[PDB]
Design a protein around this nucleic acid. Structure first.
Lengths: 95, 111, 63, 56, 63, 100, 143, 141, 206, 145
RNA sequence: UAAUUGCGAUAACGAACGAGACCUUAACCUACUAAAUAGUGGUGCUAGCAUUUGCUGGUUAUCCACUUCUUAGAGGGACUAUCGGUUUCAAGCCGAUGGAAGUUUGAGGCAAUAACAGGUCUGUGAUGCCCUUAGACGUUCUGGGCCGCACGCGCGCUACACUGACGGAGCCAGCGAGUCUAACCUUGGCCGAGAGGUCUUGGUAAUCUUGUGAAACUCCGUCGUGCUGGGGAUAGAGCAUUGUAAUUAUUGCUCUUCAACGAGGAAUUCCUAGUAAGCGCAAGUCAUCAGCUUGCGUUGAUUACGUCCCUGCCCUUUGUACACACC
RNA sequence: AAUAUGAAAA
């Protein structure tokens, strides 16, 4: 019945120990990346940290810094800021 | 046991309780135990009036075959209550209307 | 369900059976009437009894 | 001196021990309950018993 | 893809092994009086509007 | 001579009449009072299992000791305070007075 | 109209006052400011590795002003946080007593607050006046 | 004495007392201005009563609010109900029923909880589960 | 209009864009109405709601949720998942970010595009798991508009959430492009592909 | 926090105390990858070396890093508190040490082998490969073996 | 109808326990009674800015006034109230109106006849019978053990990350507990990175801990899509506390170590709104120790509003070769 | 739709 033999309980010992591509974004700018950003952010009707990371291969942190400098140089216009996401446009006079 | 507990219910009822129930549980006739209830009148158990009226006590008695437990419940008459509600929460005692003869002639009584 | 129970109906009907002239169709007057004319033991039960009394008064007015 | 919470549960514990004592010592005298008086400078334990003269 | 609109005029209780669907007598907005009976998944009221992917399927019951 | 007289009871009714009669007695003696100030109720509760042995279904049960506290403030001369502290004694109402 | 700490937003008020202490330099920042965490309940030393002490002083200066008086115990409680007790669940742990004490003691040197009756420290008269001053400065640089 | 009413607002455990009196249009909560409230998102919610009425009706009312209890959202709701009902009491007691009624109709037509306290109360926890209804996991073997 | 000034100064835009008209934080409700005669009474749009947080009791009745503005329904189905329960502060912050992003991406009203998103990803048929002897057999049935709205909002939120998880893209913006894709009928939207797949299986199993 | 091009001086990877260190990650974590220095110790020595914390290790020059290594070998000379190091007291020398990489592994093995040879219970447990700090092994850690 | 709840029918009439009625708690009270152990306003005294007329504070022997908020005692209130549909046209139900609330208003307490050969003689000075009773199975002392680990199973606590992690800010609750002739809850000051140490302080408690200034939450910064600052298991070294005594590490802290874990197979648990869930707090045991439960509060969803399809329940009819009763 | 069996006495 329910009680197994000691030899069968030895199958507890016989159980044994058996059981059930990264992306390479920039993270550092160069002259070529610097040229790329000020030529393309005039495009990208919507600019944010994630969009810059996705479509310019910047390492996120430097994407944030570049956004502040793009703001300082005025090519960008704010819609909202937050300590975890920011929303930006091309400083468009169209809207 | 039978005569003794019947004496208790008879005593309590003539003493004026609205109901009583005495149960003896234990070995009694044979080794296997059973429980006998000798209730009479009527007893409530559930509603809060159980605290108000139901007096209860349990005592163990020890003899040669073992132990027996006696539970006594006594629903005292709420009408006799010197304190607490005079009657159960569902008691609705309507006061009878004093019969009035209809008057036909208007009249005025001077001072 | 709001189905009033047997005790409510007994007390309600008993009141009307002997206090029709003094009762009214207004819940408030019958409730404050009931408070003194019957020895109901709780406010909740009193309101239930009062409410059904007026319900039956409306019924009698119907026919 | 002692807090009110502790003081009154001590009263309860005191009453229970007294009630147990009286229900152990006064059963043959038809003991039926206790009420405890608490007065300034005085306290008295009133017993209810059928055999008052026997507990006397 | 073609569409057709319709309005429920009667609701006829629930249906489905677990009561999943509801019987609804539906009425098309276009070609009025062409009343139909449909099964509906989710809660509906009367005087409600439903878009049918097809019009003339019917059901008196469902498993 | 100011005194604060305070009441503690597990039962409401006895304590309430003590407060009412103490307040009314002092007033008919024209004694200044601060009314029957009522403290928050101390609801002691013990949470414990019903079953003694601990087998069977997990069921829990709470017992309550409600504790009521009252106190009244009087500025009163001693020779009448003799009567004030001894006028009313009732069961279950632990009463005590404090001078100032 | 008038100026009070309660009238300007906390965030701008506190960073303005922290920069003031950093710029003024009258504050006696302890040597261990670079070695220490704000409490054993945190897990990294501050990210403004130098201006954090000025931030703490500005915050504690604002809080003593807003309150009648506070002490180190309230300060540790207030700046404490949820500590990961490893695997075991987060437990609220107060801030570090020494650092929240030396901010008060350095704050005492500048004289913005004073030891007060009922224990603890109460915002001083002159400290209050200059606290309203920087409060005025914040609400004027807004526009 | 300057004319005044004294209205309370509550939501869950949070309470707020709203002293309303004739003044220069001054709005403060806990000794700090209404425009300073946090969380920033709920700022517009607290503006809702005065935003609907038009702030001209506060030109001559001075409202100061103290709030305690609850949390960072219950406090906001208590504040909104407190200033809502504070305006009502002032316009009932010292202005006219016409202003009171139009105000009350405007307030409710936007949102009932401006004047009526939310009836939801926290249901007591019961033995046998973390919450009021949830139970521990039933295991059969 | 008049710039009424109080002892407590209140900023100009708060008078302008909010007192003169009971807008959303930025956007209006006027001229915004669903393209579906079925959902006209279930989208709750064209009702002044203002901020997307409200402590109303929508659970007492079955259809009392049909009076909820769909933006609050969007916020609700946004926070539902797992560790995100409660935290409607984060929820409203995220939806506000999302409406900002939407109007950045396009000229139409963000509350208009979300409405078209709902009326576009609301499945119009679904097959119930109805039992049968031996093996269960499907049955295609029509769907209530309330179920349509609930399913559409549910599908939009998961299409947002499943894309947000474990990557750089933030929840607010992934929700926005999901919403724009749904409104314009893009199959790259998770909701639209799920909706017409459900209708596809219903069409097979009528 | 400025936009500036790193010149050719930037290198993508560097060597530090027999361990390779990633370049484009921040310097503090660049150090923490080393055995024997976690986030706390690495942040402290980075501050003590006074190098730019915000910069990535990829673009820092040798002079800062050689000083950094010197801080690691001799923290006691640079006023690092006694309590901050991972070998605050030694079981042979009254001096206070801090061991890095191969040294800490070799020292760990010595400590275990010291316990074993003196036949302490903890050393005996380590010899048999079991839990030593009192865990209930009944249900715990079956699969590590 | 939630209800053997009623309306009715009626060889039954009249009744009793149960349900209900009830009791407690949670929602309304500009009402009574009030309140230096709760407050508020005004006036004094005082501080700051305004410089000001206004604003925000400190100060009970500054006093005065008041009970809106807070505690309460007694009471009111809700009774499906009113309206419109719907049914022997009855009980009732549905919608709308008002209302603090219209699911028995919400949650509990109590909770019947009969029974199990359910759990306990390891709670009991409650005990029957048997054993034992002095090299005792009594009592007590020293040290282990109850934790021991090849494995299987059950409650859970952590996470597998950008709805975050981290740092610096904003920073708001409730239930509750606490010493005196014995030592609790501890404020404030000082010392120490920290735990903690030190000198005093209030509190037998709406008076002090304690506004328990909790966490989650929000705001600003480091990050970066990567087994990464996620996770911190695992081990070492060291520093204190409780305890006569920690060692087979009580527990806390510091540094270092940084494994599994990529949303989880067949299966399966719980849950209809302040409910699930997240988030902690108090009490319990406690000399120290929580991942445990009993409560409490913060934030606060989705989907139902139905069904008898799975598991079951209650009543009626039915069949039975079952009655220790479909095992 | 598939749904077999459950020792001896008491």
């Amino acid at each position: 019945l329910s009680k197994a033999a000691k030899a069968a309980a030895a199958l507890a010992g016989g159980k044994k120990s058996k059981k059930k591509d990264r992306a390479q974004h920039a993270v550092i700018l160069d002259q070529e990346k610097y040229d790329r950003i000020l030529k393309e952010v005039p495009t990208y009707r919507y600019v944010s940290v994630s969009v810059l990371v996705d479509r310019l291969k910047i390492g996120g942190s430097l994407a944030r810094i570049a956004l502040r400098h793009l703001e300082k140089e005025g090519i960008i216009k704010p819609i909202s800021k937050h300590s975890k996401q920011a929303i930006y446009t091309r400083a468009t006079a169209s809207e | 046991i039978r005569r003794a507990a019947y004496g208790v219910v008879r005593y309590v009822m003539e003493s004026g309780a609205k109901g009583c129930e005495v149960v003896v549980s234990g070995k009694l006739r044979a080794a296997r135990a059973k429980a006998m209830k000798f209730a009479d009148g009527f007893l409530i158990h559930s509603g809060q009036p159980v605290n108000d009226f139901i007096d209860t006590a349990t005592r163990h008695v020890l003899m040669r075959q073992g132990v027996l437990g006696i539970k006594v419940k006594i629903m005292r008459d709420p009408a006799k209550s010197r304190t607490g509600p005079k009657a159960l929460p569902d008691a609705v005692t309507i006061i009878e209307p004093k019969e009035e003869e209809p008057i036909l002639a208007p009249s005025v009584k001077d001072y | 369900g709001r189905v009033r129970t047997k005790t409510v109906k007994r007390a309600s009907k008993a009141l009307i059976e002997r206090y029709y002239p003094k009762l009214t169709l207004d819940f408030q007057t019958n409730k404050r009437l009931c408070d003194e004319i019957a020895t109901i033991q709780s406010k909740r039960l009193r309101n239930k009894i009062a409410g059904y009394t007026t319900h039956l008064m409306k019924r009698i007015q119907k026919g | 001196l002692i807090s009110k919470k502790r003081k009154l549960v001590a009263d309860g514990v005191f009453y229970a021990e007294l009630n147990e004592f009286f229900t152990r010592e006064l059963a043959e005298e038809g003991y039926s309950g206790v009420e405890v008086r608490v007065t300034p400078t005085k306290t008295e334990v009133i017993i209810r018993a059928t055999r008052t003269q026997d507990v006397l | 893809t073609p569409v057709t609109l319709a309005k429920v005029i009667k609701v006829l209780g629930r249906t489905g092994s677990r009561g999943g669907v509801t019987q609804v007598r539906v009425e098309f907005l276009e070609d009025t009086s062409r009343t139909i009976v449909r099964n509906v998944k989710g809660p509906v009221r009367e005087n409600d509007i439903l878009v049918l992917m097809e019009s003339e399927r019917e059901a008196r019951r469902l498993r | 001579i100011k005194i604060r007289i305070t009441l503690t009871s597990t039962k409401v009714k006895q304590l309430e009449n003590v407060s009412s009669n103490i307040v009314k007695n002092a007033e008919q003696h024209n004694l200044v009072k601060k009314g029957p100030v009522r403290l928050p109720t101390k609801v002691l509760k013990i949470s414990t299992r019903k079953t003694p042995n601990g087998e069977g279904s997990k069921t829990w049960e709470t017992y309550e000791m409600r504790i009521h506290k009252r106190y009244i403030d009087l500025e009163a001369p001693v020779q009448i305070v003799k009567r004030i502290t001894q006028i009313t004694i009732e069961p279950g109402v632990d009463v005590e007075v404090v001078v100032a | 109209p008038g100026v009070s700490v309660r009238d300007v937003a906390a965030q701008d008020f506190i960073n303005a006052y922290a920069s003031f202490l950093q710029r003024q330099g009258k504050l006696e920042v302890p040597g261990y400011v670079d070695i220490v965490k704000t409490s054993s309940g945190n897990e990294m030393p501050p990210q403004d590795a130098e201006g954090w002490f000025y931030k703490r002083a500005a915050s504690v200066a604002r809080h003593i002003y807003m309150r009648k008086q506070v002490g180190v115990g309230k300060l540790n409680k207030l700046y404490g946080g949820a500590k990961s007790r490893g695997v075991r669940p987060y437990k609220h742990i107060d801030a570090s007593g020494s650092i929240n004490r030396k901010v008060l003691q350095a704050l005492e040197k500048i004289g913005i607050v004073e030891i007060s009756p009922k224990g603890g420290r109460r915002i001083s008269e002159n400290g209050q006046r200059d606290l309203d001053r920087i409060a005025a400065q914040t609400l004027e640089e807004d526009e | 004495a300057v004319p005044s009413v004294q209205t309370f607002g509550k939501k869950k455990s949070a309470t707020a007392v709203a002293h309303v009196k004739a003044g220069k249009g001054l709005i403060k909560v806990n000794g700090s201005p209404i425009t300073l409230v946090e969380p920033e998102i709920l700022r517009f919610k607290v503006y809702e009563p005065l935003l609907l009425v038009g702030l001209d009706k506060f030109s001559n009312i001075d409202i100061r609010v103290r709030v305690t209890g609850g949390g960072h959202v219950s406090q906001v709701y208590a504040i909104r109900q407190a200033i809502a009902k504070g305006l009502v009491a002032y316009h009932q007691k010292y202005v006219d029923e016409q202003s009171k009624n139009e105000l009350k109709k405007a307030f409710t037509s936007y949102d009932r909880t401006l004047l009526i306290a939310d009836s939801r109360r926290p249901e007591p926890k019961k033995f046998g589960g973390k919450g009021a209804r949830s139970r521990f996991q039933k295991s059969y073997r | 209009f008049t710039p009424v000034v109080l002892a407590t100064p209140i900023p100009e835009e708060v008078q302008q864009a909010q007192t003169e008209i009971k807008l959303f934080n930025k956007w209006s409700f006027e001229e915004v109405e669903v393209k579906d005669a079925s959902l006209v009474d279930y989208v709750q749009v064209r009702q002044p709601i203002f901020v997307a947080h409200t402590a109303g009791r929508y659970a007492n009745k079955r259809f009392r949720k049909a009076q909820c503005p769909i933006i609050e329904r969007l916020t609700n189905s946004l926070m539902m998942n797992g560790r995100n329960n409660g935290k409607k502060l984060k929820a409203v912050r995220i939806i506000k970010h999302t409406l900002d992003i939407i109007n950045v991406l396009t000229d139409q009203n963000p509350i208009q595009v979300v409405v078209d998103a709902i009326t576009n990803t609301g499945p119009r048929e679904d097959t119930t798991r109805v039992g049968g002897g031996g093996a269960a057999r499907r049955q295609a049935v029509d769907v209530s508009p309330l179920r349509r709205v609930n399913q559409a909002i549910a599908l939009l939120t998961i299409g947002a959430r499943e894309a947000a998880f474990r990557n750089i893209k933030t929840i607010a913006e992934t929700l926005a492009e999901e919403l724009i894709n749904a409104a314009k009928g893009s199959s790259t939207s998770y909701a639209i592909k799920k909706k017409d797949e459900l209708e596809r299986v219903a069409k097979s199993n009528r | 926090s400025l936009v500036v091009q790193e010149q050719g001086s930037f290198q993508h990877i560097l060597r530090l105390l027999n361990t390779n260190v990633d370049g484009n990650i921040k310097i503090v974590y660049a150090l923490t990858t080393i055995k024997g220095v976690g986030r706390r110790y690495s942040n402290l020595v980075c501050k003590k070396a006074d190098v730019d914390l915000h910069k990535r290790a990829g673009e820092l020059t040798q002079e800062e890093l050689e000083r950094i290594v010197q801080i690691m070998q001799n923290p006691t000379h640079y006023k690092i508190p006694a309590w901050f190091l991972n070998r605050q007291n030694d079981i042979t020398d009254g001096k206070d040490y801090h061991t890095l990489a191969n040294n800490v592994e070799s020292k760990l093995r010595d400590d275990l082998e010291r316990l074993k040879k003196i036949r302490a219970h903890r050393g005996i447990r380590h010899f048999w490969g079991l839990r030593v700090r009192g865990q209930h092994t009944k249900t715990t850690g079956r699969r590590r073996a």
